Design an enzyme around this catalytic site. Structure first.
Site, PDB file in Angstrom:
ATOM      1  N   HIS B  41     -35.614  69.665  59.104  1.00 15.66           N
ATOM      2  CA  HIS B  41     -36.284  69.183  60.194  1.00 15.66           C
ATOM      3  C   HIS B  41     -37.026  67.729  59.802  1.00 15.66           C
ATOM      4  CE1 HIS B  41     -39.813  71.622  58.846  1.00 15.66           C
ATOM      5  NE2 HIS B  41     -40.460  70.568  59.067  1.00 15.66           N
ATOM      6  N   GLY B 143     -47.677  68.585  57.629  1.00 13.63           N
ATOM      7  CA  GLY B 143     -47.398  67.865  56.467  1.00 13.63           C
ATOM      8  C   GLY B 143     -47.182  68.502  55.314  1.00 13.63           C
ATOM      9  N   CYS B 145     -44.866  71.043  54.837  1.00 11.93           N
ATOM     10  CA  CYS B 145     -43.370  71.266  54.679  1.00 11.93           C
ATOM     11  C   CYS B 145     -42.696  70.928  53.570  1.00 11.93           C
ATOM     12  CB  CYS B 145     -42.571  70.854  56.211  1.00 11.93           C
ATOM     13  SG  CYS B 145     -43.449  71.959  57.565  1.00 11.93           S
TER      14      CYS B 145
HETATM   15  C1  LIG Z   1     -42.759  70.401  62.671  1.00 14.39           C
HETATM   16  C2  LIG Z   1     -43.325  71.472  61.620  1.00 14.39           C
HETATM   17  C3  LIG Z   1     -43.334  72.521  62.529  1.00 14.39           C
HETATM   18  C4  LIG Z   1     -44.216  73.727  61.720  1.00 14.39           C
HETATM   19  O1  LIG Z   1     -44.391  74.903  62.137  1.00 14.39           O
HETATM   20  N1  LIG Z   1     -44.986  73.538  60.493  1.00 14.39           N
HETATM   21  C5  LIG Z   1     -46.180  73.563  59.895  1.00 14.39           C
HETATM   22  C6  LIG Z   1     -46.182  74.202  58.631  1.00 14.39           C
HETATM   23  N2  LIG Z   1     -47.159  74.840  58.136  1.00 14.39           N
HETATM   24  N3  LIG Z   1     -48.261  74.870  59.008  1.00 14.39           N
HETATM   25  C7  LIG Z   1     -48.247  74.235  60.078  1.00 14.39           C
HETATM   26  C8  LIG Z   1     -47.479  73.648  60.860  1.00 14.39           C
HETATM   27  C9  LIG Z   1     -47.726  72.699  61.968  1.00 14.39           C
HETATM   28  C10 LIG Z   1     -42.171  73.319  62.717  1.00 14.39           C
HETATM   29  C11 LIG Z   1     -41.936  73.793  64.139  1.00 14.39           C
HETATM   30  C12 LIG Z   1     -40.898  74.638  64.547  1.00 14.39           C
HETATM   31  C13 LIG Z   1     -39.718  74.710  63.529  1.00 14.39           C
HETATM   32  C14 LIG Z   1     -40.077  74.511  62.246  1.00 14.39           C
HETATM   33 CL1  LIG Z   1     -38.782  74.639  60.831  1.00 14.39          CL
HETATM   34  C15 LIG Z   1     -41.269  73.552  62.082  1.00 14.39           C
END
Ligand SMILES: CC[C@H](C(=O)Nc1cnncc1C)c1cccc(Cl)c1
Ligand SMILES: CC[C@H](C(=O)Nc1cnncc1C)c1cccc(Cl)c1
EC number: 3.4.19.12
Lengths: 304, 304
Positions: B41, B143, B145
């Site tokens: 992603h 951030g 990820c």
């Molecule tokens: C753009 C990152 C976002 C996400 O959930 N990441 C984050 C990771 N950890 N804590 C908070 C957040 C915001 C996301 C949305 C939908 C699918 C996927 Cl694979 C990832």
């Protein structure tokens, strides 16, 4: 989101761990620049620990009696001296992995990461608080002496603790990096009283703010209190008295959440008086006091 | 003595973290040998995440669109490919800090350390369990990820998790290092059901053995039970059914303490049926399930 008891990344400290052996005793040392720091009890045998005369014991030791090994390589010891309860072994090679560092004496109620080591090898890392009574509730077995506690500010490691002893009660005692014990403890195999411990009130309040930020809000109530009223309750429950200095450090969390500090105190007051009624806060069934307000802000904002 | 939620020393993993940027999106990558692994992603914009067609999105990208920075130095990308939900960026330089490593897909109920990172920089380390429902309750902000989970066996890092997503419920989902999600999750901004979670019974029993070893014994009783009787109670309280495989892995702890596994099950049965009556076990007011039997043995014996 999510809130965890997070330790600092231990890499910078792993590169400083060495094994120090004197006679039949082995423990951990911290190699920074051309000096290796370790607990002075490395010079004791089991019978010496009952009532050691460290000055006399050290006099029977020469530089060549201190074996310092950094993983596989042997360090050449060219000087030794005792400073309070630590020995400083001057070596002929500066540790190439020495990070930027400071020696700091932390205050009770402050937190730090411990890198538990055995025979100079890191085994694990955990975050803890220095108790108001100057003990730490760690996880240390024989051979862990010389393991250190630290904090990291960007690229600088502030070393604050070196492990020395396990009290007969199973709690831990140690020194700052100049070898001064935190608390009344002495490095001798004698029963030693740790004071009455108290709960670190400002940390519990900080953790209640972390809970609100992360969605755990059930404990918020319609009440408020005063510092005086709150401190009567803190007294009854063996919590540290809250001061305006503590309220001031909670200011960023109060601002971020819009919950006034004395309003969070009223939530804490009700939790102390009523318990959790079988509910949890951030996955805990008790009031957590191992996060400072700075820890909560760092974790909740994303500081590296 | 003492028992802590200890993470592995993170040094070996810190040396592998890099920042990966594609367009306006930045996240973390893992640089091992001449390959950088990161969540696919990284190629999405916020509008793409609602329903991304990763194959089509990746086709608009060339090697030069992936900016990989290891602290201050820039890596030259000479290949890119998608494997399940991870991107593998071939770089022209092998990471000089690559530890001995394996990619492993862990089982639910197993534990690991997470090195939470932002912009390629490590911020903290914590230990957690992969829930029976294949989520993890981490601490991750935007951030984070690309932050990884791992275990360490002497000098070998077994990477088991790469962080991808936060579910609308605040729990976390991610993949093994071949980019296969743990659980039913997909890398799309859609509401996604995590299954009913259960408590990891074998881990709670392991932690009760750690409690006995460390002196917390109040919960031991005069009773015993059978696997069948115990599993009726485990059912009622949403605990995983205990099997003979779980009893077998508890064998070393049963041997060390002399408390037969079914006798510890009877202690756990009474705690489930009666609660803690306001008491604590190893400083916890709830039954802890984030230590496996291997974790307890390692911590209680002193493994580095
Ligand atoms: C753009 C990152 C976002 C996400 O959930 N990441 C984050 C990771 N950890 N804590 C908070 C957040 C915001 C996301 C949305 C939908 C699918 C996927 Cl694979 C990832
Ligand atoms: C010889 C080490 C011993 C000790 O308490 N160390 C340990 C450290 N941590 N967990 C367990 C043990 C056994 C000791 C006895 C008396 C005084 C002093 Cl300064 C140290």
């Amino acid at each position: 989101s999510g809130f965890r008891k997070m330790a600092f990344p231990s890499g910078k400290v792993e590169g400083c761990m060495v094994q120090v052996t004197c006679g039949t005793t082995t423990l951990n040392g911290l190699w920074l620049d051309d000096v290796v720091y370790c607990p002075r009890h490395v010079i004791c045998t089991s019978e010496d620990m009952l009532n050691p005369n460290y000055e006399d014991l050290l006099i029977r030791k020469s530089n060549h009696n201190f074996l310092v090994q950094a993983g596989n390589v042997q360090l050449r010891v060219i000087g030794h001296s005792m400073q309070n309860c630590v020995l400083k072994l001057k070596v002929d090679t500066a540790n190439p992995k020495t990070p930027k560092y400071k020696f700091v004496r932390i205050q009770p109620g402050q937190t730090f990461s411990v890198l538990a080591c055995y025979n100079g090898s890191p085994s694990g890392v955990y975050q803890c608080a220095m108790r108001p009574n100057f003990t730490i509730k760690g996880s240390f077995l024989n051979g862990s002496c010389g393991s250190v506690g630290f904090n990291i500010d960007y690229d600088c490691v502030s070393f604050c603790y070196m492990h020395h002893m396990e009290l007969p009660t199973g709690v831990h005692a140690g020194t700052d990096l100049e070898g001064n014990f935190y608390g009344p403890f002495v490095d001798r195999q004698t029963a030693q009283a740790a004071g009455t411990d108290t709960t670190i009130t400002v940390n519990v309040l900080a953790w209640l703010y972390a809970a609100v930020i992360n969605g755990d809000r059930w404990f918020l109530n319609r009440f408020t209190t005063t510092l005086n009223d709150f401190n009567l309750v803190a007294m009854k429950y063996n919590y540290e008295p809250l001061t305006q200095d503590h309220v001031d450090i909670l200011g960023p969390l109060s601002a971020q959440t819009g919950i006034a500090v004395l309003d969070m105190c009223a939530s804490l007051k009700e939790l102390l008086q009523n318990g959790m009624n079988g509910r949890t806060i951030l996955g805990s069934a008790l009031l957590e006091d191992e996060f400072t307000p700075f820890d909560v802000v760092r974790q909740c904002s994303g500081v590296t």
